[PDB]
Amino acid sequence: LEYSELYPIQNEYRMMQSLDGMWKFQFDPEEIGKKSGWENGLPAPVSMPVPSSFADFFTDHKERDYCGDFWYETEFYLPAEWRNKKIWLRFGSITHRGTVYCNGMEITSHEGGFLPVLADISTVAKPGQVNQVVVKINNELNETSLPCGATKILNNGRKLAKPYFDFFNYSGLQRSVWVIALPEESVKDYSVDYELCGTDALVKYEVVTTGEHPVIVRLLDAEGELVAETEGKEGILQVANARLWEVRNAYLYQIVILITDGNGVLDEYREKIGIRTVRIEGTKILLNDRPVYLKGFGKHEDFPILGRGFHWGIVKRDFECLKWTNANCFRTSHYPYAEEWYQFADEEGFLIIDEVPAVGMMTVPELLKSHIADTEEMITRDKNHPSVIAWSLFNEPETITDYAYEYFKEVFAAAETYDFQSRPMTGAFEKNSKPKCYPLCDFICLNRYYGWYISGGPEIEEAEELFRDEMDRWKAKELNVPFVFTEFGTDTMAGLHKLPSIMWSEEYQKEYLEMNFRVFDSYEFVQGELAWNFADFQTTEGIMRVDGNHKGVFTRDRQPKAAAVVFKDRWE
Amino acid sequence: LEYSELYPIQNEYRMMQSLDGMWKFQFDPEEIGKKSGWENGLPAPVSMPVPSSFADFFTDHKERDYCGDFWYETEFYLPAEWRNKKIWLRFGSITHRGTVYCNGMEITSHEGGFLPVLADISTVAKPGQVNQVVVKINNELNETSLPCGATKILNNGRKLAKPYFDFFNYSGLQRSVWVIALPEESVKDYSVDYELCGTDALVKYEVVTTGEHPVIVRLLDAEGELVAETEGKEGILQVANARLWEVRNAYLYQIVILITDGNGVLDEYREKIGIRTVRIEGTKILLNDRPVYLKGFGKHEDFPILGRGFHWGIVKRDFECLKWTNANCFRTSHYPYAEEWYQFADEEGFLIIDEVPAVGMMLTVPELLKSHIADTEEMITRDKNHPSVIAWSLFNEPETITDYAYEYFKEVFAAAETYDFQSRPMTGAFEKNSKPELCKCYPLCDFICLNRYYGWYISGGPEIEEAEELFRDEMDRWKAKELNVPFVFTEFGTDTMAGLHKLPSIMWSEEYQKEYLEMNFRVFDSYEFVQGELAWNFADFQTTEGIMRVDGNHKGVFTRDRQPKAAAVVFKDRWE
Ligand SMILES: O=C(O)[C@H]1O[C@@H](O)[C@H](O)[C@@H](O)[C@@H]1O
Ligand SMILES: O=C(O)[C@H]1O[C@@H](O)[C@H](O)[C@@H](O)[C@@H]1O
Numbered sequence A: 001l002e003y004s005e006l007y008p009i010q011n012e013y014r015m016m017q018s019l020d021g022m023w024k025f026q027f028d029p030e031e032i033g034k035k036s037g038w039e040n041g042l043p044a045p046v047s048m049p050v051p052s053s054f055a056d057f058f059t060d061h062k063e064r065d066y067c068g069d070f071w072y073e074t075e076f077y078l079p080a081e082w083r084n085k086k087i088w089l090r091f092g093s094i095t096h097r098g099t100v101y102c103n104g105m106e107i108t109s110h111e112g113g114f115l116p117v118l119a120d121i122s123t124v125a126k127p128g129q130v131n132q133v134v135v136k137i138n139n140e141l142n143e144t145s146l147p148c149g150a151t152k153i154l155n156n157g158r159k160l161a162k163p164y165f166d167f168f169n170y171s172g173l174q175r176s177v178w179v180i181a182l183p184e185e186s187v188k189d190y191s192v193d194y195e196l197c198g199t200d201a202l203v204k205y206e207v208v209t210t211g212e213h214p215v216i217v218r219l220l221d222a223e224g225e226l227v228a229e230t231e232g233k234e235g236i237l238q239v240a241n242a243r244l245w246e247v248r249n250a251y252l253y254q255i256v257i258l259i260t261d262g263n264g265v266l267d268e269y270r271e272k273i274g275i276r277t278v279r280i281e282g283t284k285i286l287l288n289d290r291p292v293y294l295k296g297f298g299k300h301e302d303f304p305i306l307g308r309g310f311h312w313g314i315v316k317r318d319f320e321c322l323k324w325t326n327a328n329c330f331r332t333s334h335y336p337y338a339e340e341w342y343q344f345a346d347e348e349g350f351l352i353i354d355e356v357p358a359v360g361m362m363t364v365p366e367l368l369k370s371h372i373a374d375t376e377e378m379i380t381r382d383k384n385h386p387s388v389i390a391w392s393l394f395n396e397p398e399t400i401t402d403y404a405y406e407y408f409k410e411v412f413a414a415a416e417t418y419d420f421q422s423r424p425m426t427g428a429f430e431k432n433s434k435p436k437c438y439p440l441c442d443f444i445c446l447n448r449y450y451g452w453y454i455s456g457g458p459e460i461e462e463a464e465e466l467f468r469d470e471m472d473r474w475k476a477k478e479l480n481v482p483f484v485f486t487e488f489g490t491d492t493m494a495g496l497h498k499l500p501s502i503m504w505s506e507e508y509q510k511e512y513l514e515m516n517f518r519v520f521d522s523y524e525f526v527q528g529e530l531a532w533n534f535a536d537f538q539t540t541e542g543i544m545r546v547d548g549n550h551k552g553v554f555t556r557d558r559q560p561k562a563a564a565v566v567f568k569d570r571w572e
Numbered sequence B: 001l002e003y004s005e006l007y008p009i010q011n012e013y014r015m016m017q018s019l020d021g022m023w024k025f026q027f028d029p030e031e032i033g034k035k036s037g038w039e040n041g042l043p044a045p046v047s048m049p050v051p052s053s054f055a056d057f058f059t060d061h062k063e064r065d066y067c068g069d070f071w072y073e074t075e076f077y078l079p080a081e082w083r084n085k086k087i088w089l090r091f092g093s094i095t096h097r098g099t100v101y102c103n104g105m106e107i108t109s110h111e112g113g114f115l116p117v118l119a120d121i122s123t124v125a126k127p128g129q130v131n132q133v134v135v136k137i138n139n140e141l142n143e144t145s146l147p148c149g150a151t152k153i154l155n156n157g158r159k160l161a162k163p164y165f166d167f168f169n170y171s172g173l174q175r176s177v178w179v180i181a182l183p184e185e186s187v188k189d190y191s192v193d194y195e196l197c198g199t200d201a202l203v204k205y206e207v208v209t210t211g212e213h214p215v216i217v218r219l220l221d222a223e224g225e226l227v228a229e230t231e232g233k234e235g236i237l238q239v240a241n242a243r244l245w246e247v248r249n250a251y252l253y254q255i256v257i258l259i260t261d262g263n264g265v266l267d268e269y270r271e272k273i274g275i276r277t278v279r280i281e282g283t284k285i286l287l288n289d290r291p292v293y294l295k296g297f298g299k300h301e302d303f304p305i306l307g308r309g310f311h312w313g314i315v316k317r318d319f320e321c322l323k324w325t326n327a328n329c330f331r332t333s334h335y336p337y338a339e340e341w342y343q344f345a346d347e348e349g350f351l352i353i354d355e356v357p358a359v360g361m362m363l364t365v366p367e368l369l370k371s372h373i374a375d376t377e378e379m380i381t382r383d384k385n386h387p388s389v390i391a392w393s394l395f396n397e398p399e400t401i402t403d404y405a406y407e408y409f410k411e412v413f414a415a416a417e418t419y420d421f422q423s424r425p426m427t428g429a430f431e432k433n434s435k436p437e438l439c440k441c442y443p444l445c446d447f448i449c450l451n452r453y454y455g456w457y458i459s460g461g462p463e464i465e466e467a468e469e470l471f472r473d474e475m476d477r478w479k480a481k482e483l484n485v486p487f488v489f490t491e492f493g494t495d496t497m498a499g500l501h502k503l504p505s506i507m508w509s510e511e512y513q514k515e516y517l518e519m520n521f522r523v524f525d526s527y528e529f530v531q532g533e534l535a536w537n538f539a540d541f542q543t544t545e546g547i548m549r550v551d552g553n554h555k556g557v558f559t560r561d562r563q564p565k566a567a568a569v570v571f572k573d574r575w576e
Helices: A312-325 A339-348 A364-382 A402-418 A457-477 A506-520 A563-571 B312-325 B339-348 B365-383 B403-419 B461-480 B510-524 B567-575
Strands: A015-018 A021-027 A046-050 A069-078 A086-091 A097-102 A105-111 A117-120 A129-138 A149-153 A159-163 A177-182 A187-197 A200-209 A215-220 A226-231 A234-239 A253-261 A264-273 A278-281 A284-287 A294-298 A329-331 A351-355 A388-395 A425-429 A444-447 A483-487 A526-531 B015-018 B021-027 B046-050 B069-078 B086-091 B097-102 B105-111 B117-120 B129-138 B149-153 B159-163 B177-182 B187-197 B200-209 B215-220 B226-231 B234-239 B253-260 B265-273 B278-281 B284-287 B294-298 B329-331 B351-355 B389-396 B426-430 B448-451 B487-491 B530-535
Touching: A021 B312, A046 A069, A046 B312, A086 A097, A097 A117, A105 A117, A187 A253, A187 A264, A200 A215, A200 A253, A215 A234, A226 A234, A264 A339, A284 A526, A294 A312, A294 A483, A312 A339, A312 A563, A312 B021, A312 B046, A329 A526, A339 A351, A339 A364, A364 A388, A364 A402, A388 A402, A402 A425, A425 A483, A457 A506, A506 A526, A506 A563, B046 B069, B086 B097, B097 B117, B105 B117, B187 B253, B187 B265, B200 B215, B200 B253, B215 B234, B226 B234, B284 B530, B294 B312, B294 B487, B312 B339, B312 B567, B329 B530, B339 B351, B339 B365, B365 B389, B365 B403, B389 B403, B403 B426, B426 B487, B461 B510, B510 B530, B510 B567
Parallel strands: A294 A329, A294 A526, A329 A351, A351 A388, A388 A425, A425 A444, A444 A483, A483 A526, B294 B329, B294 B530, B329 B351, B351 B389, B389 B426, B426 B448, B448 B487, B487 B530
Antiparallel strands: A015 A177, A021 A046, A021 A069, A069 A129, A086 A117, A086 A177, A097 A105, A097 A129, A149 A159, A187 A200, A200 A234, A215 A226, A215 A253, A253 A264, A278 A284, B015 B177, B021 B046, B021 B069, B069 B129, B086 B117, B086 B177, B097 B105, B097 B129, B149 B159, B187 B200, B200 B234, B215 B226, B215 B253, B253 B265, B278 B284
C-alpha cells in the first residue's frame, strides 16, 4: 500500500489532531459540485455530525434515502510546529467511495467504505494557518465493488440504492477523522507472529519503514518493563515465562518500534499486542494449543440515530452485554468495523472473525480486484490484534460452479500473502451451497435458518429433521474440519408473547434456539455457534422487515429479549 | 471568576487537544481513594467512555445505581511547544462535584455538575512528556448544592441517590474534556450588548484580559469582511446596514478580539455572535422590536445508553425535529446544557431560556444560596454572548409564599443582574402551589413562567372538563391582578405510552395526549397576556424508578429515540 494503516498515536515524533465535530455538508443530486468549484468550499451547506451516518437525522424521505454524490467540508488550524513533517488526513472510513481535497487540491480517491483512507497533504498543507478539507463522497451500489447492489433511477432522475444485502445503506463519514504529522522517515507497517516454546514464547516480526536507517524493536510487559529487545527490520523477540493472551483473560504486551540514526531516535511507534497462537487441528480450533468452542454473535455497526457512526459508548455497552451472555466471540458481519472494536476486544479477551464486505455478490474481474484490495487493506490494518483469529472472506456468494472456485482461489491466495501469521481463513455459506469452495476454507462457517425461512412455526419438527438430514450428510463427508454456525435466528418483536408460541414471538425465539442447540450438540465437529444477530438493526424497508431486522437477541437500544438468558445459561 | 469560561479555540496563540475517548474508571465505595494514592493512578480500573454518563453501560443494578465517590483517569502527551504557556484542563462539566489532579498534584475542586471546570496545570504540566489527569468525582445529592436531594444508606453501607427532582441522577464526565494552552496575557472574558438604530446597529462591548496591553476589537460579517473596528477594552462597534439575527433566520457576525504588543499580537479570540435585542414591553416579548410568541419545549440532555453524554448527533436530530414542529424556542430544563447546544441554536435561529439547576429546593439555606448564586454567575458568564439566549430561568418550582423565600430570590436575581451585561429577561418556573394571591416572588420576574398540569395531575381523564374550568378560574385570577407582564407556560403535558391507543381516550393513551393539548390551547388562547407555550417534554426521558414512572417520564411528544407520537403533528399544525 502507498500509505500506512497504523493507528495514529501521539508522541515526540508523531502528532494528531481530531477533526471530529460538526462539518459542513451538501447533497449534490445534479452532480454539479466539481464543475461548480465545490472542492474550494460548499455554497449552501447544512451542518453534519462526524462521525455519523447522515441518513437518520433528517425528517424527510428524500434526504434519508439520498443516493448519489454528496459533499463534506471542514476547516482546521495546523500548528506551525508541524512544518517539515509528513502531514496526512486520516479517515477511519469514507462510505462508500470518495475523493479527498485539501486547500482546493485533489489528494487521493478511495473505493470501499469500511476501511481507512489516507491522504498525503504534505505538499499543500499550510502550517500556522487555517486549512480546508473537502470530500466528495458517493454511496451508490454496483456489481464491481463491495458490498454489491444496484442503483435505481426514478423517472424524475432521483436515485435509490437497491442493496443485494440485508442491511440499510448507511453512508457518509461514519468514523473518526484526524489530521496527523509523521516524521520524514517513519514506521509504515509491522507484522508479528507467535511461537510457543514451553513456558517461553517467540515473537517473530517484520518492520517496514520509509527509509534505510536502523530499527530497534523492544517488547514491554503490561507494567512497562522491558522483556525483550533486538535490532533489525526482521527479527525474533525471546520472551521468558511469557504471559499468554487467553480467551476472556487478556494480557497485552507493548511493542515499541524505533528508527535511529547516529544522533538518536527518528521515529517511535508503539502498540499493544497479545502473545497467542491459533491453529486448526482436525475438527478442533486451538487457541494456545487448547481447544476453544466459539460462543457469540454476528453484530453490526448500528445504533439509533447515529447509524454506523462510531462511539465508544456503543462499544462499552455492547461488550458489557456480551460478557453478561458469557460470549467469547463475534464476527464483524458484514464489513470490517471501526478499529476501536478490535482494540477493545484485545483488552477484554474476545475472539474476532474479521470479515471483508463480500456480501451480495452476483464485471467479474473488476469485482475480484475490489475484493482483493479490501482483503489486503483489512488484513494489513487488523493483523496485529490478538483478538483477530480468523478472516472471513465472503458471506453467501455463489459456490456451485468451476469459475467461482477460480475466483475465490485468488482471494484466499491474496489473504495468505498479506497475513504474516497465516491464520485460519473461512467464509459463511448459505444453504444453496448444498453438501468446490469449502476446501479453500480452514474451517467451515454455515448460515442456517431451519425453523425460520425453512419449515418455520408449526413445521419446526420438520425443520429439525431437515437440519439433521443436512448435518448427517456433512458428517458422512468426514471432512475432518471444524464447523461453526455463523448465523441462526428468528425475527422477534419485543413484547410479542404467545402461548403456544408463534413465529415473531419471544417464546418462539427461545424454542427455535433450543432446537438448534439440540442439533449442534449432536455433531462432534461443530466447534462454534454465533447467533444472528446480537441486536436488532436497520435494513431497507419492505414487506419482510418490520423497522429493520428483528433477529436481535437484544433490542436496538441494547436490552435483552427473553432468549438472551437462554444464551447466558448455555454459555456459562 | 478565577478562570475563563470562553469556549476553547485553536490559532497561532491558543492551542487545544481533545482528551475524549476511553478513560480509566473505578468506583470507590469505601471512600479510600485519596487515602490510597489513587490520585497517582487507579489500582484496578475498568474502561469508561468520555463524554458519557456512566450508569447505563453496566448490566448490574449496583453499578448503574452507584452513589458516592468514583474516579476517572487518563494520560495524554503534551507537545513540547506548549512550554511556559498557561496550560489548563477544561472539563465541559464534572457531575456533580469533584477534585482534579494532574501529575499527582491537587489542582482545583468544583461544586456543580453542569458547567465548565477549569484547572490551571501550568506549574505541574510536563511539556514534551506523557501527563496524567485523575479526577475524584462524587454524585451524592444534598440540600446545600444544586440540584437538591438526599442520600440514603442501605443496610450494608451502600448509598442510593434520592432526588427531589424528576430526572435520573446521571453523573460522571458527561461532556468533552480538553487540555489547552493560552498566552501568558490572554483574553479572559468579553461581553456584548446591542442597540438598533434604524438600519444600523451598535455592538457595545467590554473585554477583560489578564494584562495591561492594548486591545483591538474587530467585527467581521458572515463572509469574513471587516465591518467595524475599534480600540480599547470598552467600546462601541458601529455596524452600517446591520444584518440582524432573526428568529429561525439567523445571521452571525464574528467578533475578533486582539491583544497587541506594538509591533505584534499577543492573543486573539474569535467567536460568532448575532445582533439582536430582546425586551419585555407590557404583556409582549419583543425580539428586534417585534412581538414574538414562544413555541417549543422543555428538553433534557438525555439519550439511550449515553445518558446526558454530549453528542453532536443528538443535537442534529433534535433540531431537525424541532424545525419540523415549527418550534422557535426551548428551555434548558433543568440545568445548563453542553455549550454546543447554544452554538447550534445560534446557527439555527432558536430562542433559548437558559436555566440554572435550581430544582428540588423545597440552617443549610445560606450555603444553598451561595451555591445557587455561584451556578448563576457561571451560567451567565458562560452563555451571555449567545444570541439564542434571550432569558434566564433562575428556578423551577421552589417555595415562594414566605418572606424568607423572597429575600433568598432577591439575592439570586441581584447577582444575575450584576453578571448579565445585557440585563436580558429573568424569570423562573412556578408550580401551582405558588397561588396568585399567596406568591411573593413573581414581582422579581421580567415575565412569568407557569408549569401547569390541569388535565393530568389535577382532574385528569373523565374530569378533564373540570380541569379546564379550574384552569380558567386560575387564569381569571391572574388576569384580575393586572400585572401587565407576559405569561409563558413552561410546562404542560401527559404521560403517553407510544402505541397505547384507546377510543374513547384514556390517560396514558396517544389520543388523550392530543385532547389534553387541545384543551390547554383553548385556555391559552383565551388570555391576551399569554405569550408563549413550551410543552413538557420534547422527548421521553429517564427518571428514578418508581410506581409513577414507566421506564422514565413519558410526557415526551417524541419517543426517547426521537420519533413522533400522534401529538407531535398537533404542535406542527398549530405552530405553522
Ligand atoms: O435474512 C436474514 O436475517 C439474514 O440472512 C443471512 O443470509 C444474511 O447473512 C444476513 O446478513 C441476513 O440478515
Ligand atoms: O411531573 C412531571 O412530569 C414534571 O413535573 C414538573 O413539576 C417538573 O418541573 C418536571 O421536571 C417534571 O418532569
